[PDB]
Tab-separated table of C-alpha atoms and ligand atoms in Angstrom:
chain	number	residue	atom	x	y	z
A	1	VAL	CA	105.915	167.211	58.535
A	2	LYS	CA	106.261	163.555	59.465
A	3	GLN	CA	110.049	163.543	59.576
A	4	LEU	CA	109.732	165.685	62.715
A	5	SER	CA	109.166	162.533	64.766
A	6	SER	CA	112.341	160.583	64.015
A	7	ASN	CA	115.139	160.391	66.576
A	8	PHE	CA	117.966	160.211	64.035
A	9	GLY	CA	119.790	158.313	66.759
A	10	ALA	CA	118.980	160.508	69.761
A	11	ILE	CA	117.148	159.616	72.963
A	12	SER	CA	113.917	161.495	72.221
A	13	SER	CA	112.250	162.940	69.161
A	14	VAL	CA	110.971	165.983	71.075
A	15	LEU	CA	113.674	168.577	71.812
A	16	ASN	CA	111.644	169.698	74.852
A	17	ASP	CA	112.229	166.088	76.077
A	18	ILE	CA	115.820	166.110	74.694
A	19	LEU	CA	116.405	169.241	76.833
A	20	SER	CA	114.339	167.454	79.517
A	21	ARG	CA	116.564	164.372	79.630
A	22	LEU	CA	120.130	164.989	78.280
A	23	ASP	CA	121.276	168.602	79.120
A	24	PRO	CA	123.961	170.993	77.552
A	25	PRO	CA	127.202	168.869	78.050
A	26	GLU	CA	125.137	165.957	76.598
A	27	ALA	CA	122.554	168.134	74.731
A	28	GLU	CA	125.443	169.370	72.540
A	29	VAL	CA	125.401	165.620	71.661
A	30	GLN	CA	121.673	164.839	71.474
A	31	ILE	CA	120.459	168.136	70.013
A	32	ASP	CA	123.101	167.993	67.302
A	33	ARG	CA	121.770	164.728	65.850
A	34	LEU	CA	118.281	166.198	65.619
A	35	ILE	CA	119.687	169.285	63.921
A	36	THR	CA	121.595	167.127	61.451
A	37	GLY	CA	118.563	165.003	60.556
A	38	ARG	CA	116.092	167.849	60.228
A	39	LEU	CA	118.439	169.941	58.086
A	40	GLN	CA	118.770	167.069	55.622
A	41	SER	CA	115.000	166.584	55.541
A	42	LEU	CA	114.505	170.259	54.701
A	43	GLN	CA	117.173	170.241	52.000
A	44	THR	CA	115.607	167.251	50.270
A	45	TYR	CA	112.248	169.029	50.273
A	46	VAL	CA	113.690	172.192	48.752
A	47	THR	CA	115.657	170.395	46.017
A	48	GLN	CA	112.631	168.436	44.927
B	1	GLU	CA	116.934	150.329	11.164
B	2	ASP	CA	119.427	147.449	11.398
B	3	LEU	CA	122.545	149.535	10.831
B	4	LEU	CA	121.308	151.650	13.729
B	5	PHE	CA	120.789	148.762	16.145
B	6	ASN	CA	124.274	147.477	15.340
B	7	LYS	CA	126.111	150.750	15.891
B	8	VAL	CA	124.816	151.513	19.389
B	9	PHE	CA	123.560	142.827	41.865
B	10	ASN	CA	122.736	144.118	45.331
B	11	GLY	CA	119.351	145.792	45.510
B	12	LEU	CA	119.692	147.121	41.949
B	13	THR	CA	117.366	146.027	39.161
B	14	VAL	CA	116.496	147.089	35.628
B	15	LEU	CA	112.878	147.079	34.519
B	16	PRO	CA	111.954	146.322	30.909
B	17	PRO	CA	110.164	148.887	28.743
B	18	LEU	CA	106.477	148.408	28.072
B	19	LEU	CA	106.815	148.570	24.283
B	20	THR	CA	109.221	146.042	22.823
C	1	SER	CA	135.955	122.541	58.061
C	2	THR	CA	133.027	120.885	56.265
C	3	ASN	CA	131.646	119.491	52.999
C	4	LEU	CA	130.459	121.698	50.139
C	5	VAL	CA	126.947	121.702	48.685
C	6	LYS	CA	126.140	123.219	45.300
C	7	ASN	CA	123.048	124.822	43.744
C	8	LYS	CA	121.544	126.155	46.986
C	9	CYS	CA	121.620	129.542	48.667
C	10	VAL	CA	124.121	128.985	51.472
C	11	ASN	CA	126.354	131.003	53.769
C	12	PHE	CA	129.810	130.106	52.560
C	13	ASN	CA	133.231	130.766	54.039
C	14	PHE	CA	136.436	129.968	52.163
C	15	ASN	CA	139.520	130.778	54.262
C	16	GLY	CA	138.055	134.130	55.335
C	17	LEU	CA	136.204	134.990	52.163
C	18	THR	CA	132.728	135.337	53.669
C	19	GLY	CA	129.481	135.722	51.789
C	20	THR	CA	126.196	134.130	50.854
C	21	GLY	CA	124.822	132.817	47.592
C	22	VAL	CA	124.634	129.759	45.379
C	23	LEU	CA	127.777	127.962	44.219
C	24	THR	CA	128.024	126.194	40.880
C	25	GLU	CA	130.874	124.636	38.934
C	26	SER	CA	132.548	126.825	36.352
C	27	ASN	CA	134.571	127.069	33.125
C	28	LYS	CA	137.240	129.451	34.358
C	29	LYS	CA	140.933	128.689	34.729
C	30	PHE	CA	142.809	130.561	37.431
C	31	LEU	CA	146.571	130.745	37.744
C	32	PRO	CA	148.046	128.264	40.221
C	33	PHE	CA	148.705	131.015	42.757
C	34	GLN	CA	145.321	132.739	42.310
C	35	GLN	CA	142.780	132.002	45.020
C	36	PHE	CA	139.596	133.805	43.971
C	37	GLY	CA	138.222	135.941	41.170
C	38	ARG	CA	136.343	139.197	41.033
C	39	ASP	CA	134.746	141.212	38.252
C	40	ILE	CA	134.315	144.862	37.348
C	41	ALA	CA	132.830	146.816	40.292
C	42	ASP	CA	134.986	144.458	42.389
C	43	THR	CA	132.491	141.860	43.579
C	44	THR	CA	133.612	138.287	44.164
C	45	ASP	CA	132.150	136.086	41.449
C	46	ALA	CA	134.382	133.015	41.705
C	47	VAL	CA	136.439	131.185	44.304
C	48	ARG	CA	138.855	128.283	44.670
C	49	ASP	CA	138.192	125.844	47.373
C	50	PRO	CA	141.280	124.918	49.353
C	51	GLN	CA	140.902	121.118	49.263
C	52	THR	CA	139.627	120.039	45.848
C	53	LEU	CA	141.561	122.736	43.944
C	54	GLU	CA	138.455	123.417	41.871
C	55	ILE	CA	137.070	126.852	41.055
C	56	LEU	CA	133.399	127.600	41.644
C	57	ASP	CA	131.085	130.292	40.332
C	58	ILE	CA	129.213	132.396	42.878
C	59	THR	CA	125.753	133.718	42.027
C	60	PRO	CA	123.647	135.909	44.307
C	61	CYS	CA	120.553	134.172	45.688
C	62	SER	CA	117.435	135.303	43.800
C	63	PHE	CA	115.609	138.427	44.972
C	64	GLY	CA	113.152	140.894	43.502
C	65	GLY	CA	110.085	143.000	43.993
C	66	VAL	CA	106.480	141.941	44.380
C	67	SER	CA	103.662	143.807	42.675
C	68	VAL	CA	99.950	143.177	43.012
C	69	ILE	CA	97.600	143.702	40.082
C	70	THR	CA	94.190	144.915	41.245
C	71	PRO	CA	91.130	145.414	39.036
C	72	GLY	CA	90.057	148.067	41.521
C	73	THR	CA	88.601	147.291	44.942
C	74	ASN	CA	85.342	148.946	43.808
C	75	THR	CA	84.926	146.159	41.251
C	76	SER	CA	86.295	143.025	42.905
C	77	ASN	CA	88.605	141.632	45.569
C	78	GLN	CA	90.599	139.395	43.213
C	79	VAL	CA	94.289	140.130	42.687
C	80	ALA	CA	97.206	138.784	40.693
C	81	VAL	CA	100.842	138.869	41.788
C	82	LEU	CA	104.015	139.500	39.804
C	83	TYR	CA	107.406	138.411	41.118
C	84	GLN	CA	109.781	140.620	39.208
C	85	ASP	CA	112.537	138.953	37.141
C	86	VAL	CA	112.229	135.679	39.029
C	87	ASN	CA	111.901	132.280	37.427
C	88	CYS	CA	108.636	130.597	38.326
C	89	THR	CA	110.241	127.573	40.007
C	90	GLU	CA	111.541	129.596	42.966
C	91	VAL	CA	108.210	130.746	44.374
D	1	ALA	CA	178.278	150.734	35.106
D	2	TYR	CA	174.612	151.718	35.046
D	3	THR	CA	171.883	150.581	32.690
D	4	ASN	CA	168.278	151.358	31.807
D	5	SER	CA	165.387	149.038	32.552
D	6	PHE	CA	162.594	149.450	30.082
D	7	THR	CA	159.459	147.787	31.451
D	8	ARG	CA	160.686	145.407	34.125
D	9	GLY	CA	159.786	144.444	37.661
D	10	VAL	CA	156.016	144.011	37.494
D	11	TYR	CA	154.564	141.488	39.923
D	12	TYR	CA	151.056	140.310	40.705
D	13	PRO	CA	150.196	142.369	43.779
D	14	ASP	CA	147.485	140.035	45.086
D	15	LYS	CA	145.899	136.613	44.693
D	16	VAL	CA	142.880	137.930	42.804
D	17	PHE	CA	142.055	136.575	39.364
D	18	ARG	CA	140.864	139.066	36.759
D	19	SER	CA	139.579	138.496	33.239
D	20	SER	CA	139.930	140.962	30.359
D	21	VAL	CA	140.087	144.268	32.270
D	22	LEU	CA	142.345	147.219	33.082
D	23	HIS	CA	142.956	147.429	36.827
D	24	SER	CA	144.616	150.285	38.715
D	25	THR	CA	146.880	149.725	41.730
D	26	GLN	CA	148.966	151.669	44.221
D	27	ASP	CA	151.987	149.746	45.501
D	28	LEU	CA	155.793	149.551	45.555
D	29	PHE	CA	157.090	149.145	42.020
D	30	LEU	CA	160.256	149.677	40.026
D	31	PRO	CA	159.559	152.804	37.932
D	32	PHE	CA	159.766	152.435	34.171
D	33	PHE	CA	163.017	153.461	32.499
D	34	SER	CA	165.057	153.484	35.706
D	35	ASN	CA	168.729	153.712	36.607
D	36	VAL	CA	169.790	150.190	37.612
D	37	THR	CA	173.315	149.503	38.840
D	38	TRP	CA	175.432	147.019	36.930
D	39	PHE	CA	177.763	144.507	38.553
D	40	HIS	CA	180.276	142.153	36.974
D	41	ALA	CA	182.128	139.115	38.250
D	42	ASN	CA	180.404	141.480	45.589
D	43	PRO	CA	179.629	144.344	47.977
D	44	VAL	CA	177.152	145.118	50.755
D	45	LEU	CA	174.196	147.022	49.310
D	46	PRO	CA	171.238	148.762	50.974
D	47	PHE	CA	167.612	147.568	51.030
D	48	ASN	CA	165.563	150.587	52.230
D	49	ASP	CA	162.380	149.490	50.395
D	50	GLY	CA	162.317	146.238	48.453
D	51	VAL	CA	164.658	145.225	45.622
D	52	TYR	CA	164.517	144.164	42.001
D	53	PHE	CA	167.272	141.767	41.061
D	54	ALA	CA	167.956	140.153	37.684
D	55	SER	CA	170.819	137.885	36.630
D	56	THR	CA	172.055	136.130	33.499
D	57	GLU	CA	174.038	132.933	32.831
D	58	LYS	CA	173.956	129.265	31.795
E	1	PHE	CA	113.522	155.557	99.067
E	2	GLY	CA	114.695	155.947	102.641
E	3	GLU	CA	114.369	152.308	103.639
E	4	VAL	CA	115.906	150.667	100.565
E	5	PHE	CA	118.982	152.831	100.977
E	6	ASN	CA	118.969	151.868	104.653
E	7	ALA	CA	117.873	148.237	104.467
E	8	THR	CA	120.123	146.265	106.766
E	9	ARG	CA	120.711	143.203	104.562
E	10	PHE	CA	121.357	143.551	100.826
E	11	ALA	CA	121.212	140.560	98.516
E	12	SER	CA	124.117	139.283	96.454
E	13	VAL	CA	124.457	140.121	92.790
E	14	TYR	CA	122.961	136.969	91.351
E	15	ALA	CA	119.909	137.241	93.588
E	16	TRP	CA	119.262	140.949	93.031
E	17	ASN	CA	115.735	142.027	93.970
E	18	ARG	CA	113.290	144.616	92.595
E	19	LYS	CA	111.400	147.012	94.892
E	20	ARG	CA	108.186	147.544	92.845
E	21	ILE	CA	107.805	151.320	93.438
E	22	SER	CA	105.009	153.567	92.069
E	23	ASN	CA	102.376	156.123	93.066
E	24	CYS	CA	104.466	158.363	95.373
E	25	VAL	CA	106.576	161.654	95.531
E	26	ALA	CA	110.325	161.239	94.783
E	27	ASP	CA	112.673	163.789	96.349
E	28	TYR	CA	116.219	163.527	95.065
E	29	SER	CA	117.683	166.486	96.951
E	30	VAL	CA	119.187	164.684	99.934
E	31	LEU	CA	119.761	161.584	97.819
E	32	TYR	CA	121.880	163.780	95.579
E	33	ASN	CA	123.739	165.667	98.297
E	34	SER	CA	123.920	163.147	101.131
E	35	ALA	CA	127.702	163.715	100.904
E	36	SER	CA	128.375	160.007	101.399
E	37	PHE	CA	127.930	158.273	98.037
E	38	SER	CA	131.280	157.360	96.545
E	39	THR	CA	129.756	156.843	93.093
E	40	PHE	CA	126.691	158.662	91.793
E	41	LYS	CA	126.318	158.719	88.032
E	42	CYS	CA	123.733	158.054	85.404
E	43	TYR	CA	122.620	158.290	81.825
E	44	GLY	CA	119.705	159.241	79.665
E	45	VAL	CA	118.583	161.806	82.217
E	46	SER	CA	120.669	164.663	83.553
E	47	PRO	CA	121.484	164.506	87.277
E	48	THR	CA	119.635	167.796	87.926
E	49	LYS	CA	116.676	166.937	85.639
E	50	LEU	CA	114.992	163.989	87.544
E	51	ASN	CA	113.947	166.443	90.367
E	52	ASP	CA	110.816	167.470	88.368
E	53	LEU	CA	110.677	165.002	85.450
E	54	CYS	CA	107.529	162.950	86.180
E	55	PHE	CA	107.859	159.212	85.465
E	56	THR	CA	105.527	156.445	84.355
E	57	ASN	CA	106.939	153.598	86.434
E	58	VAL	CA	110.243	153.232	88.251
E	59	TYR	CA	112.107	150.112	89.359
E	60	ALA	CA	114.762	149.878	92.056
E	61	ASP	CA	117.316	147.089	92.259
E	62	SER	CA	120.106	146.410	94.716
E	63	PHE	CA	122.967	144.023	95.394
E	64	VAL	CA	126.547	143.902	96.682
E	65	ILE	CA	129.603	143.701	94.438
E	66	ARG	CA	133.356	143.727	94.759
E	67	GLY	CA	134.898	147.169	95.027
E	68	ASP	CA	136.904	147.671	91.860
E	69	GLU	CA	134.245	145.853	89.836
E	70	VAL	CA	131.853	148.773	90.295
E	71	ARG	CA	132.525	150.204	86.849
E	72	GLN	CA	131.187	147.081	85.221
E	73	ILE	CA	127.672	148.116	86.277
E	74	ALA	CA	127.254	150.366	83.250
E	75	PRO	CA	126.102	149.792	79.671
E	76	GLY	CA	128.613	148.551	77.152
E	77	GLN	CA	131.480	146.777	78.869
E	78	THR	CA	132.437	143.415	80.301
E	79	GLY	CA	133.645	141.885	83.528
E	80	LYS	CA	132.981	138.540	85.161
E	81	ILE	CA	130.259	140.137	87.282
E	82	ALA	CA	128.612	142.138	84.526
E	83	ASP	CA	128.965	139.120	82.254
E	84	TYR	CA	126.940	136.507	84.114
E	85	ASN	CA	125.025	138.226	86.923
E	86	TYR	CA	123.697	141.633	85.861
E	87	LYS	CA	123.898	143.745	82.744
E	88	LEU	CA	121.993	146.801	81.673
E	89	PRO	CA	120.264	147.303	78.301
E	90	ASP	CA	122.113	149.814	76.147
E	91	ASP	CA	118.967	151.996	76.022
E	92	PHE	CA	119.101	152.437	79.793
E	93	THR	CA	117.257	155.443	81.227
E	94	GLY	CA	117.793	155.312	84.975
E	95	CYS	CA	120.508	156.012	87.523
E	96	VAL	CA	123.225	154.040	89.294
F	1	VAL	CA	128.258	150.234	43.490
F	2	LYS	CA	131.872	151.339	43.918
F	3	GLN	CA	130.770	153.256	47.018
F	4	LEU	CA	129.886	150.033	48.843
F	5	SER	CA	133.596	149.682	49.525
F	6	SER	CA	134.434	152.904	51.336
F	7	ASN	CA	134.764	153.269	55.091
F	8	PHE	CA	133.540	156.846	55.533
F	9	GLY	CA	135.573	156.768	58.740
F	10	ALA	CA	135.016	153.275	60.085
F	11	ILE	CA	137.210	150.278	60.762
F	12	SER	CA	136.140	148.405	57.624
F	13	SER	CA	133.568	148.368	54.830
F	14	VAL	CA	132.019	145.019	55.789
F	15	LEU	CA	129.263	144.592	58.345
F	16	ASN	CA	130.440	141.044	59.032
F	17	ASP	CA	133.735	142.583	60.170
F	18	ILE	CA	132.260	145.147	62.537
F	19	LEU	CA	129.902	142.474	63.861
F	20	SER	CA	132.879	140.168	64.522
F	21	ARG	CA	135.512	142.300	66.271
F	22	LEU	CA	133.311	144.669	68.259
F	23	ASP	CA	130.728	144.271	70.973
F	24	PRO	CA	127.222	145.577	70.224
F	25	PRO	CA	127.728	148.863	72.123
F	26	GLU	CA	130.819	149.631	70.026
F	27	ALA	CA	129.513	148.372	66.692
F	28	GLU	CA	126.569	150.794	66.706
F	29	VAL	CA	128.940	153.749	66.411
F	30	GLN	CA	130.757	152.126	63.512
F	31	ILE	CA	127.613	150.987	61.706
F	32	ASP	CA	126.132	154.476	61.852
F	33	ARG	CA	129.178	155.903	60.072
F	34	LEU	CA	128.518	153.514	57.184
F	35	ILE	CA	124.775	154.157	57.177
F	36	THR	CA	125.271	157.906	56.869
F	37	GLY	CA	127.708	157.579	53.976
F	38	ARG	CA	125.649	155.062	52.039
F	39	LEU	CA	122.495	157.136	52.469
F	40	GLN	CA	124.323	160.189	51.172
F	41	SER	CA	125.539	158.291	48.136
F	42	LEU	CA	122.141	156.818	47.298
F	43	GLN	CA	120.469	160.202	47.577
F	44	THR	CA	123.074	161.822	45.328
F	45	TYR	CA	122.354	159.120	42.759
F	46	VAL	CA	118.638	159.843	42.982
F	47	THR	CA	119.034	163.621	42.563
F	48	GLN	CA	121.220	163.367	39.480
G	101	NAG	C1	82.370	152.794	42.844
G	101	NAG	O1	81.379	152.327	43.758
G	101	NAG	C2	80.319	153.273	43.952
G	101	NAG	C3	79.423	152.715	45.031
G	101	NAG	O2	78.952	151.415	44.705
G	101	NAG	C4	79.591	153.515	42.631
G	101	NAG	O3	78.630	154.546	42.816
G	101	NAG	C5	80.568	153.925	41.533
G	101	NAG	O4	79.900	153.936	40.274
G	101	NAG	C6	81.751	152.962	41.461
G	101	NAG	N1	82.739	153.444	40.510
G	101	NAG	C7	82.916	152.914	39.293
G	101	NAG	C8	82.035	151.752	38.946
G	101	NAG	O5	83.756	153.349	38.510
G	102	NAG	C1	113.450	129.045	34.190
G	102	NAG	O1	113.778	127.764	34.749
G	102	NAG	C2	113.610	126.658	33.850
G	102	NAG	C3	113.903	125.403	34.638
G	102	NAG	O2	115.277	125.052	34.553
G	102	NAG	C4	114.539	126.834	32.656
G	102	NAG	O3	114.354	125.753	31.751
G	102	NAG	C5	114.250	128.157	31.966
G	102	NAG	O4	115.196	128.365	30.925
G	102	NAG	C6	114.333	129.315	32.961
G	102	NAG	N1	113.993	130.575	32.314
G	102	NAG	C7	112.831	130.815	31.687
G	102	NAG	C8	112.690	132.178	31.079
G	102	NAG	O5	111.937	129.980	31.617
G	103	NAG	C1	172.358	157.118	37.016
G	103	NAG	O1	172.747	158.009	38.070
G	103	NAG	C2	174.141	158.336	38.037
G	103	NAG	C3	174.425	159.164	39.266
G	103	NAG	O2	175.555	160.004	39.067
G	103	NAG	C4	174.465	159.066	36.737
G	103	NAG	O3	175.863	159.327	36.698
G	103	NAG	C5	174.056	158.219	35.537
G	103	NAG	O4	174.245	158.950	34.332
G	103	NAG	C6	172.595	157.790	35.660
G	103	NAG	N1	172.232	156.898	34.572
G	103	NAG	C7	171.204	157.129	33.753
G	103	NAG	C8	170.960	156.088	32.701
G	103	NAG	O5	170.500	158.125	33.854
G	104	NAG	C1	119.168	156.609	106.591
G	104	NAG	O1	120.123	156.639	107.681
G	104	NAG	C2	120.813	157.884	107.868
G	104	NAG	C3	121.764	157.682	109.025
G	104	NAG	O2	121.148	157.975	110.272
G	104	NAG	C4	119.808	159.005	108.115
G	104	NAG	O3	120.500	160.242	108.253
G	104	NAG	C5	118.821	159.073	106.960
G	104	NAG	O4	117.845	160.078	107.210
G	104	NAG	C6	118.133	157.724	106.779
G	104	NAG	N1	117.180	157.771	105.680
G	104	NAG	C7	117.489	158.071	104.411
G	104	NAG	C8	116.344	158.073	103.443
G	104	NAG	O5	118.637	158.325	104.055
């Protein structure tokens, strides 16, 4: 649950505020870092 | 027990076992 | 360039070899063209200094973990502290 | 004439000292058991990538 | 916004000034499409987003620079003017 | 330990070399490439 509040190197931790600030041309950049970090979080949970 | 004991840096440390 | 101090954690720089640690004198013998040594896992563990022509051992500067031994806060507020694999002089 | 090197043309590829170990390198070497020209006594040769060169006399 | 963009005398780079601006309604429509601004660009926030994004506090700065040097007012580069007079933190979230 | 000397797609393996021939805005992008690789390697060690 708590890893849902890391930026993983983006501008915001909330995707509603990632889509509020950096949009599609640049959301393909900021949303992708959130996707990358959250996927890894979930995979660590499932392996353990 | 002797023949048996004779036959067999950067953020990394090794902790000793509790029983010697 | 500057002088060289031994037996203290320093930031050294020999010709471009850059690191930090404590430098002591050694019992190795390089080959006249060899300028520094490294061990398995390829970390630098010796060096030659370019003015004395003497080789020096490099040892990382002490580090470790800190653990606190508590008899339970429901019994006391006293604690003890363990500095893991550190000699007592360096605390 | 041509001749066969056996284990020849090994050089220290860096300034690094190493104690009793087995270290692996990638570099430009003269392959073992190679086909080395023989000259007696000479002509213009190529270079193309480094050169081993031995010689014998008093 | 109307007066800062139409103030008659702007300060030089080294003496740039801050218009403390808060507690108001910001309307970026004309500011966006005034059809006169040779260089509108910004970061952090999309150019079409600010229109409704509410903000905590906003600061406005102004100065006058040499022409070609304009690019140096942006995060992450150098230039005699951006070196000694004005540079922007790399976490910048405004518009230029 | 032998993974502390891979680039993972960076200019070097040393942080004192990215902090010496790059300005802070350009060294972030190169430090993150090392961080990601080293985190991956440490977490593989911990799973096995
Ligand atoms: C912990 O403290 C409570 C409150 O004083 C006490 O009831 C309890 O017995 C204590 N637990 C022990 C002594 O193990
Ligand atoms: C700790 O340092 C002292 C002081 O030199 C030394 O005599 C001793 O051998 C070291 N190690 C231990 C385990 O005491
Ligand atoms: C070397 O190559 C030449 C090329 O014709 C060949 O005639 C000769 O037999 C070779 N020598 C050896 C030792 O293989
Ligand atoms: C600034 O001056 C121009 C030129 O007359 C005018 O059209 C504009 O409304 C004024 N105010 C703002 C906020 O641009």
